[PDB]
């Protein structure tokens, strides 16, 4: 089977576990733990991968879905060691080390300032998370593949005083929205975009 | 007080689109304009510290397209004394 | 037809305009506009209540919800002048003086400080406004009839930078849920009770 | 507040645990774990009722549905003593005891042998448990109050090889739909009744 | 089972079959087919009425919804003669006859000339029949109990080429909403009212 | 960023705002105005595009979503001129003239007469618009990309006496269904297919 | 027009017509009939093709939708002859012989035994069919195109005592899940994986 | 709001023929002119966006035949803060 | 007055199909038609410039199929004297 | 609204036979004629779109035997605002 | 006043497939057939004006595949005398 993402999440920041969980219908994570992230197609190979993880470890899975296209796997647990153990089986099931993952591409990231009172209420039609208050500012990102976004969403709020909008590790591309007062957004995006580049992988 | 952002252009038209683009780009107040004569005109905006910095850069990029932009500067926290003697909209 | 509630909000606050807009299925509202909401019973009369109001003025029709028995139609418009004309157009046509409306009565009030992570998974997952994050405080207030909830939230949210997690003033009793830190929640719960306490009406 | 149902299950059977996951919106339960579900009215105390249980014990909130009057909250924990603590704390919370629960009475019972094709199409189309296949027998039973319904499923699947078509313990009266061959469904109605007949409480 | 409503339609008209077909989830009806629909209480007992009848005849089941109290059952078959067998058999199962039904009563009827555009945004957004276009007239009629609404819709479409916006004969009072020009809606509204007068029963 | 659609709708025919609106969960347009339509990938650049319009003009948007794939932009207003200013600004942000749009393709356009009573109910499962009465006729159209279709749907009713089925500015492809008596369908579809090629663009 | 799948289903095994139909919103099938399956792109020709069948035969369709991607066609009837008559017309609409369909691809076929209690309850989030009890076993298959799966899904249960989980004859890929005790899965998968290769087709 | 067209010309006569050409080209209101000192002057027109867009590019092509035309620009909706502080014929 | 727009087609049909397509495309008022003799007839529409400019493009594109179209033109602001003497509806 | 069919002919004689053959072909109403000078004349018919479609082709084939036919056109839904100003037999008012 | 559609084939089979295809394509009534002898056979349908025109064209495509199609014609609104004297189904 082929490989797309391999993301190792350290210790999630609080407001993620909400949007992560309130969107999820599986073993919801909580703030302060650890979770793991690897993307593969078809969303059945995941289902086999989840066992090799679950049987060989003490973890708990939140994302196992096929609402977008094929499904994607994350498992969560408090002890970093156990998660790192869960990953260790998954790649070895595939017989590939970490650096075989695809280098991410950074498709569209731009910052939008003082959004008009209209556009706020309409974005929230996708109310997966928070709402863009009328007339603050917004940061939006696209990456290939899709799984990489949840990492970015983590390092953002972890690095600035931001309200989290909506996340897409699902789809053919990974798209992200962030909201809050102006100066923070630059501090978030500047940190976010930097999180994706520093990852090591193959073209 | 509120921060301070200013744009100085050698064309009255240049100032307007520069002014309009700012108040459209951030939570800013346009106080007025001070014409120093000789065609030079300066637009003045005031508000939060960051709002200006994003607004101004949005005016500069917008004004440079249709006018001889001269100067772009931002003052984060001007002195109490300045607003008392200069016509910058925040005079007591 | 019985007119239950008619409370005019001086100016719809920044969050509610999104929150009301995040769930409505008609003409979306905008921030800063003044808004009057009228609650009446039976639900079959709402089609006539708005049709009289919509035909008389230039107001905008946002929501027309058919509940178990009663029907509510609320209109909003930035022009404060329309409120006196349109209200008299609706209120003088459907058996009601301003004081003739039902006076709201606070059914239940409870504040649960510092929600634990487990509650964060359960709390906002059934909400469409802002996400309830783990560790924050939540104060829950209810108004009877349901339409009266907007006066509770808009009065609280105006006075403090709090977060609106969910608000549904459709049904028999309206729910207003606000989230934030202890101090910001402290004054709001005080401001919410007094604002509900001064509401003129009947029983 | 009137305490309707509070039943701690010694061990949730293998089949029913799945049905909770097909319907839960929080932390999913797991097979073999003991679980207590507490339903009370009015529903506004449930956010506080769970907050009393979660802060006092290690229980997990699986499902919390806000109905017109009553509220249902379900707890699960592997330590039978730990589940009882949240239950003992919850039951003692309203200064109540064991006898405060609603006494069970068999509401409605009907055995329809050999489900017809016309009924088969409608049956599982309104169900989230196992699908009723054409030709199998279906017994539909109702319990009052609804919270006591969990004993019905746990009694059948452990004591008999039946198939659970649907079970919904939120609302006024709980619906229990089990499907299978003629013989296995026969014993369950006896096994479901004896647990329903022995359920202690008051009226 | 208490037999609330039972009116058998001689032959489903061309338009309604779509509206019934756009919402049914069972054995679908077709245009020109004869149909008998029986509404009884309690709704939990309806599962036996269809299940016994389906085992006795070749009729087709379109909709069978069990609510808190009322029950609705719809049968479809090209042969008009078959309908009398199951219905007389069904009434003989609930120990009832033709005169035992409840007589329908026309609750409210109102024609609002020139429907406004703002309501059309709210009107058709909550409707599953034809879309309400601006300028046409809309006739809304209500019957108590709800089941009698099916006679209203079948009456309107036959006499004029009018449009069925929504029809729900499940609930307390049935809604029949027809759209068209002012004159065409006028005659249609006339046909609906007389239908309440000819329904034999009690009050 | 790349461009796909750039269609400027002159003065919409009435019935659109319905299917437009029933599809829309934003600032619904109304019939008799003008509106704009822009679909681009990725559906985030749209969100930035929406400002340049909303900041520089007096408009109103209904569609901004990614329920289908990548996102879609529509803004609407009565005055043709004001909208035309919004569109021209959008491309200037992209720095592309008109002729950068892709030529439309006319893949499958066929006319289907006297649909069998069955197929009517099934299309109406897609109850996005009106219902195909049993035995009228139906037209089917395909174009790539998707945005071009609403142009066809407009130019359709604009040219014949038609009932509107369902339209796709959503998806990877633009698909069209129309309903009504025979001669109109021949007259409507013949107008649409001819409308599509006349667009100027690059392959 | 192009060709992808061509499946002629002989006489369906019981439990499918439930899951086939209960998943479907069309003319639900029943166990013991025959059905046909043909995939073509684009998913509008499906809509036209379905008539050519219905006009020239006595059949009935269950699947005719575009909720997933492009649409797919199945029609059902008890008499084997009628379906084989319908099939011959569909391909003849294309002026394409029998043998033009693509040979299938077999991507991922692996068997999983005694799944951990977690992974069971989460699969049922996709509750299209039966549930994988905690610690039974699971079979997962992927084939391209998607329509072939019900062929595979049939040949399985027809040959062993297995429970059907979830099916995708829709989409760009066909994925299948099965549930039951161990030896059956080995006996089922042995037939399923073998079911796909025996099909004859074009590269 | 009522959209905006402007023309800034170093020299008086050019401004007039530009203005005269504008109000004759489409339905627009000539509201006044601004003298910025140093010879720069600017004509200001308000109206619907279709006129000005057709009006300006009609005035420019007629004034550019006389004097040095500095700038030409059009704002389809000046932010209400602009119309309030600046002399553009719509201050309340 | 409001703006103007005209099409004339040696052939009474071409005027109609043009007159139709124009009304359907924008919010304009079809005032009538003027017959110049010799088979030449001229349709006249009135309204805002953007409306006319869009209507006329649709009309010309619609009459080109079935007529010998002679002329197509748009006046954004007719001087007051014209409407007073010539019959373009808007005549007091 | 009622549909619209039109035949134009450089010659009065053509228009009549065009008119006659039309009303005999389908259920349409011949409402009048318009003289544009220069010998050009246009016949006007209203009715069902399907009827007009068949009538229009029946006139052209019948008029082409006589005089030169300038134009032949068919309009399903003419806009409401048209029928007010032009002399097409369905002018409202009284 | 119903329309009239006819199909004439030199093969009894050709007529049948021709007849069936029509009533399958539109709301048409198939009255009967008049066998003119010599293998020539004529199918007759009556109904709406357009439905026949669509049905007729749809029958030919089906009949041409299996028979010597001879004539296909459509009559929109036949005279009263025709229906009164000929076996065309709409006779009193």
Short mmCIF file of C-alpha atoms in Angstrom, two decimals, chain F residues 113-114 135 182-183 186, chain K residues 25-26 50-51 54 61:
data_model
loop_
_atom_site.label_atom_id
_atom_site.label_comp_id
_atom_site.label_asym_id
_atom_site.label_seq_id
_atom_site.Cartn_x
_atom_site.Cartn_y
_atom_site.Cartn_z
CA UNK F 113 -40.48 12.31 -23.86
CA UNK F 114 -43.31 10.82 -21.77
CA UNK F 135 -45.49 11.69 -18.40
CA UNK F 182 -43.50 18.68 -24.92
CA UNK F 183 -43.28 21.67 -27.26
CA UNK F 186 -38.05 21.24 -27.38
CA UNK K 25 -43.05 7.91 -26.58
CA UNK K 26 -45.96 10.29 -25.84
CA UNK K 50 -46.80 17.99 -30.50
CA UNK K 51 -47.09 14.51 -28.98
CA UNK K 54 -42.82 13.52 -31.43
CA UNK K 61 -36.77 5.30 -36.07
#
